[PDB]
Amino acid sequence: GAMGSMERASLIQKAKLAEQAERYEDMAAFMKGAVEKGEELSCEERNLLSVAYKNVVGGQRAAWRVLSSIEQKSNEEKGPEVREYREKVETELQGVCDTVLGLLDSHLIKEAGDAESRVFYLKMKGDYYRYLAEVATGDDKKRIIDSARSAYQEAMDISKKEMPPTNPIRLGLALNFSVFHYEIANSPEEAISLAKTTFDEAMADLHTLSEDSYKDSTLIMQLLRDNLTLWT
């Protein structure tokens, strides 16, 4: 690959410079090159990978939503331009999701390693299928929804067995799986029930956490609570 001649340590250093420069496409390319060295990622490295691609895909999802809205407001009756441009953005978004899903399958998702790492990557797999599901139609969408559910469910099973209710990876997975239920799977009752259980069981354990831990967990609990506010 394009990063094949660069030292792993140098790719991680350049990913952090890219993040400081808000150059997220560069950050993602450096992190992909580091993953392709075939060594495990540290906790910090996983977060760099996640930040890089979340920012790339985030800009494409926001663009697709702007163009989709303009497209739907002009479908009350025109010209092909809004549809053509929305299709172009959609194909780019799909390209990024396919890149991430390929890295997860080829390099990162293993039977071994700590629960936190396994949950982190299966959650990412569910997230990137969820993004494909947002733009998919027909048979393809049904296949993608099944893939998303299967990755999220596998991560939920591990997180419930191996991590405490306030673990931020466990919380973030439950938040995202609840959004999957609500917005993709059209199961609002499952979305609400999951969010409420996650929030309540975390609330019971807060007194046990250190300063840094308390911050990380309550940030995610506030998002759970905001969705419950919106949904109920």
């Binding site: 409420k196 929030f199 309540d200 609330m203 807060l206 309550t218 609990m221 506030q222 609570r225 419950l228």
Partner: peptide
């Protein structure tokens, strides 16, 4: 400072 309990 914690999030508010559910209603």
């Amino acid at each position: 400072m914690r999030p508010r309990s559910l209603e």
